[PDB]
Amino acid sequence: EMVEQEFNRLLEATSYLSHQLDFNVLNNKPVSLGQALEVVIQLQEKHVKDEQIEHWKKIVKTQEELKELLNKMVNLKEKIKELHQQYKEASEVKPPRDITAEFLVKSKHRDLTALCKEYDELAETQGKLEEKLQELEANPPSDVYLSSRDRQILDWHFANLEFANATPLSTLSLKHWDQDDDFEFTGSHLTVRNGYSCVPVALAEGLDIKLNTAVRQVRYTASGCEVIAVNTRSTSQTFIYKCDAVLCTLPLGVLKQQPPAVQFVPPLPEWKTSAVQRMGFGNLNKVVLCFDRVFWDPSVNLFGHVGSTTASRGELFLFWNLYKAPILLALVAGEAAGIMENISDDVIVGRCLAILKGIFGSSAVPQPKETVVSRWRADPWARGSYSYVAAGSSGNDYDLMAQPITPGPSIPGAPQPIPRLFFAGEHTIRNYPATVHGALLSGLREAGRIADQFLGAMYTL
Amino acid sequence: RKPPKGMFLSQEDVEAVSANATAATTVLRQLDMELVSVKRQIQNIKQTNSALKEKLDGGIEPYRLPEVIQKCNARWTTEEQLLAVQAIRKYGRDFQAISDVIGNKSVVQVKNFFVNYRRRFNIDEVLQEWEAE
RNA sequence: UUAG
RNA sequence: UUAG
Numbered sequence A: 001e002m003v004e005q006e007f008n009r010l011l012e013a014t015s016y017l018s019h020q021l022d023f024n025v026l027n028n029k030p031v032s033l034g035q036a037l038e039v040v041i042q043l044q045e046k047h048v049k050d051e052q053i054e055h056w057k058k059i060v061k062t063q064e065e066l067k068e069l070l071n072k073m074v075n076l077k078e079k080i081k082e083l084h085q086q087y088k089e090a091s092e093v094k095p096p097r098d099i100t101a102e103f104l105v106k107s108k109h110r111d112l113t114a115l116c117k118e119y120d121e122l123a124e125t126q127g128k129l130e131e132k133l134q135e136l137e138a139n140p141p142s143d144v145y146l147s148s149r150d151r152q153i154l155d156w157h158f159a160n161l162e163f164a165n166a167t168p169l170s171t172l173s174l175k176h177w178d179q180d181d182d183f184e185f186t187g188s189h190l191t192v193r194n195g196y197s198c199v200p201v202a203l204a205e206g207l208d209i210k211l212n213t214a215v216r217q218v219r220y221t222a223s224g225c226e227v228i229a230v231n232t233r234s235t236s237q238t239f240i241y242k243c244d245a246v247l248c249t250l251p252l253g254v255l256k257q258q259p260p261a262v263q264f265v266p267p268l269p270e271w272k273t274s275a276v277q278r279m280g281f282g283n284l285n286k287v288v289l290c291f292d293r294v295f296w297d298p299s300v301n302l303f304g305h306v307g308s309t310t311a312s313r314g315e316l317f318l319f320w321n322l323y324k325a326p327i328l329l330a331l332v333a334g335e336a337a338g339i340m341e342n343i344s345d346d347v348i349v350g351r352c353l354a355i356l357k358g359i360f361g362s363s364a365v366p367q368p369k370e371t372v373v374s375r376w377r378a379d380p381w382a383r384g385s386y387s388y389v390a391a392g393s394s395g396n397d398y399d400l401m402a403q404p405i406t407p408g409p410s411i412p413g414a415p416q417p418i419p420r421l422f423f424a425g426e427h428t429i430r431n432y433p434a435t436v437h438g439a440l441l442s443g444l445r446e447a448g449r450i451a452d453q454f455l456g457a458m459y460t461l
Numbered sequence B: 001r002k003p004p005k006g007m008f009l010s011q012e013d014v015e016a017v018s019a020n021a022t023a024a025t026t027v028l029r030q031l032d033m034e035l036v037s038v039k040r041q042i043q044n045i046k047q048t049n050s051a052l053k054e055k056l057d058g059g060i061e062p063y064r065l066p067e068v069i070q071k072c073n074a075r076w077t078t079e080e081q082l083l084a085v086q087a088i089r090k091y092g093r094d095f096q097a098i099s100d101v102i103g104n105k106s107v108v109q110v111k112n113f114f115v116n117y118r119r120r121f122n123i124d125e126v127l128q129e130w131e132a133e
Numbered sequence C, D: 001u002u003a004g
């Protein structure tokens, strides 16, 4: 609770840093959420030290008050030692004595009395300062901003945030990464207990779908389009699909691929390509662990694992169990997701069991039956997981992604009113990116725009 | 429009930490040094103060005297008149002091005495000689 | 090559 | 699909 609270407080701090101090540029480069977070954290460590220093500086000021006092009390103890002796000597002059001698006794007496209670006033002040010092020395301020154990648990909340955005926090745009928070849906988050694929399969019913057909080139012209595709099972076999319009649903990762996996003819305009470069395409992976026995708490839908280091904070930081079956589903996020793809399944499953043995006991963890490891960045039909608002980008790039292309005329001096190349998919919808419902809505949008443009919109008259 | 509670972010400090790649590290170890400079200063003064307190051991108890009580009296004896004139020569116009010497004359009677014995005791030129010290 |  |  303590760290999750500080985590949320640190995020608020970055927002303040962004909106109130215009800390959105630095060295002619945009600031990332990661940069701002380190800055905030560094200033929290600076403040902890500024308070420590202020506290010790009040002690010395108090101690130097005491030293000046003790010095006066010593030089006063001596004046009193001397005046006492002078008084005794004057008192030893036995009476009867003349009045100059009686005066001396009386005079030195109150001189001695005057000083004897200056010393008492000071010894009073002494006790005060000494006590004021035991208080300070008893109430030191905070020692560190974060213990090594704190940072580690904080890194887990960062990993969970890197997981949600499918990217390292150093890639996210400080200004814009949270633009679509306002459009969040109400209600509790849910999962599909019979598999999310039941949806696309259901949608596929009644449609003409050519599977194992990899588009290689998209030609869009004043007179129509032709799409060149090959059989993925034998890439020599070629097909030419001719049409009035093309709806491009290719993932942003594919569109980013250099050299191109899909060539556009003529080449896409710079305002389109520039947007494709600026937008981020993140990555995140999962490990499926199939056992014959449940050895975990079935009532717990999910539990975490804190990384030893900041670097490995995304490495298998979270585990799912939300299916009536002996399956654990481990999550890999942030910088880990990318690096873990260059690691064999054996090693990966190994680290999973290691972590689990350390939590449920080195004996209660059997070797799994089935295992599966996603590698979405390596998947050539995806080249990543989903889009994120990269530093240097904005919400407007999502709109540019959605703008259709109108090729110029073939015949010199002819009019070219209609478009031919349309774009949909998760990366094309400004208010609901990186989601299934966002992909869904992008589809409905272009279907309506294409129909508006080719069938005509009668409802606007 | 304000940082979260207990969160500290000034225009001044952000520009300092972001001045470069190690501007952060620099600032934080300058304070680590200043934190050491003062920590040992305190250890030093603790030792110095410990020593001084050691000297005052016993304090002034061996120098305290019974404070004899005697209550005021209206009449001025020749003895008391003479104590007063001397008290004036030494203390100037500290009436409280002069009263503490004589022992049985209130602070007011001292000022009365100043006026009453105006010239019989040449009180003015006595005070002059005091101011000359 | 948005073949002319 | 020698797209209609």
Ligand SMILES: Cc1cc2nc3c(=O)[nH]c(=O)nc-3n(C[C@H](O)[C@H](O)[C@H](O)COP(=O)(O)OP(=O)(O)OC[C@H]3O[C@@H](n4cnc5c(N)ncnc54)[C@H](O)[C@@H]3O)c2cc1C
Residues within 6 Å of the ligand: A213, A214, A215, A216, A249, A250, A251, A254, A261, A262, A284, A285, A286, A376, A380, A381, A382, A384, A385, A386, A424, A425, A426, A427, A434, A435, A436, A437, A439
């Ligand atoms: C690990 C992971 C977890 C996710 N979890 C969630 C979640 O919990 N909640 C949520 O709302 N969203 C989640 N998403 C996002 C969601 O899955 C996607 O945003 C959505 O499914 C994308 O729909 P799309 O049609 O835009 O893209 P796609 O589903 O990728 O459709 C593009 C199609 O084009 C194919 N293709 C690619 N290249 C070619 C080519 N040359 N020729 C022909 N076909 C090609 C691809 O194979 C693919 O079938 C997750 C994504 C990933 C990667």
